[PDB]
């Protein structure tokens, strides 16, 4: 029973890196020979397993984690990372067991004039735990005075645009990233390679 | 097949507004990534792009000729209209419209439509 | 105005031609998605190259992109009578999608 990866890979909508997506991906037959097949990603980083021995391993649980960022802040999808995206989007733990998978989508998400419709949160109070999620709209008191509600000085919205522009650099278009966590737990596996 | 055909009048005079309209078929106008533009090109002159419209009903002009262009789709009649106020002798030109993806700029155009602007 | 392209370029049948497209402008960034149209006597645009050297289906070998900075390139190997036309360069400002000003193309017969 082939797991649903072309869901998840090939979905025609993407989340914005600050309300991210995630699948459950069980009881089902992982074959990765469709993404190692595929030429266009350029980030393929794997921590606490083999990426040639993936068709091999077997695992409890996986999770698909989907969203978009900007291609300098790829980086940032790593165990142990700062940033405002692993700090305040999309955290991933020091003890990390899984894969991460980006590629450019310049050819999607870049819009003449700018794509604005991309988010990532600018502010936030503190960092986010690994796998947190947050997705308030909340206007941020960056100073002493009360905002109720209402955006003036030091009183910010906490979501900022990315802006994608089709005459960007490589480092500044966006790309699109597939976050696979591997769960081995000390029960049988639902989650098999071929 | 990708085909896009603009229709609309031939002739207009200076201070009135002019509406195209294109009418596609072959693809969809609500997949990710599409676009249908318009464009122009005054006989013997330079094509010139006007106005764009996304999939997601984000638009986009031309920044010199913004304030007098309007477009608009209608998703169910397969219909992208242009709407352009205060026409002048100057904006007399073959009309076009196009498929749009941000990795070919434009593809398909239509035949085109000679508009003539005439007191 | 924002690309700037011979007016005009001649060939003999046989030849290779090459007609460049300078930005004249930072506002192309990194000028990556460059298309070509030849355009014949009032017929529409045709799309022959785009992302500066990319063929889309159905377009003969003998066009091919290239770039060199701020400058994109088409040539024409094998120039034939029916390649004479209206050759048009396209890119993208941080608003607009741009054209060149157009070379007519002759291939003298």
């Known amino acids: 029973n082939l797991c649903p990866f072309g869901e998840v890979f090939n979905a025609t909508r993407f989340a914005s890196v600050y309300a991210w997506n995630r699948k459950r991906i069980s009881n089902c037959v992982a074959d990765y020979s469709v993404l190692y097949n595929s030429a266009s990603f350029s980030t393929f980083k794997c921590y606490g397993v083999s990426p040639t021995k993936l068709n091999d391993l077997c695992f409890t649980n996986v999770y698909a984690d989907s969203f978009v960022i900007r291609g300098d802040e790829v980086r940032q999808i790593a165990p142990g990372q700062t940033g405002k995206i692993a700090d305040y989007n999309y955290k991933l733990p020091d003890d990390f067991t899984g894969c991460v998978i980006a590629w450019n989508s310049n050819n999607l998400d870049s819009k003449v004039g700018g794509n604005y419709n991309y988010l990532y949160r600018l502010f936030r109070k503190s960092n986010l735990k690994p796998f947190e999620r947050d997705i308030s709209t909340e206007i941020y008191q960056a100073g002493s005075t009360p905002c109720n509600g209402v955006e003036g000085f030091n009183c910010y919205f906490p979501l900022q645009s990315y802006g994608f522009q089709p005459t960007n650099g490589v480092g500044y278009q966006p790309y699109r990233v597939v976050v696979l966590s591997f769960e081995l737990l000390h029960a049988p596996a639902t989650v098999c390679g071929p | 097949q990708i085909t896009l055909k603009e229709s609309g009048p031939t002739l207009v005079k200076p201070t009135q507004t002019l509406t195209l309209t294109c009418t596609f078929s072959?693809?969809?106008?609500?997949?990710?990534?599409?676009?249908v533009g318009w464009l122009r090109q005054p006989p013997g002159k330079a094509l010139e792009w006007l106005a764009l419209?996304?999939?997601?009903?984000?638009?986009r002009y031309s920044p010199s000729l913004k304030s007098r262009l309007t477009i608009s789709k209608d998703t169910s009649k397969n219909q992208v209209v242009l709407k352009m106020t205060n026409i002048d002798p100057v904006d007399t030109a073959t009309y076009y419209c196009?498929?749009?993806?941000?990795?070919?700029?434009?593809?398909?155009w239509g035949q085109g439509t000679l508009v003539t602007v005439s007191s | 105005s924002a690309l700037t392209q011979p007016a005009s370029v001649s060939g003999s049948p046989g030849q290779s031609i090459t007609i460049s497209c300078t930005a004249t402008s930072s506002d192309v960034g990194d000028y990556n998605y460059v298309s070509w149209y030849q355009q014949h006597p009032g017929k529409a645009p045709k799309l022959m190259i785009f992302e500066v050297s990319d063929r889309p289906s159905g377009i003969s070998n003998r066009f091919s992109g290239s770039k060199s900075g701020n400058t994109a390139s088409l040539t024409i190997s094998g120039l034939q009578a029916e390649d004479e036309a209206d050759y048009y360069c396209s890119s993208y400002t941080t608003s607009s999608a741009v054209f060149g000003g157009g070379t007519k193309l002759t291939v003298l017969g």
């Open positions: 072959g693809f969809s106008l609500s997949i990710s990534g599409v676009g």
């Open positions: 419209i996304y999939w997601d009903d984000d638009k």
């Open positions: 196009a498929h749009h993806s941000i990795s070919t700029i434009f593809d398909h």
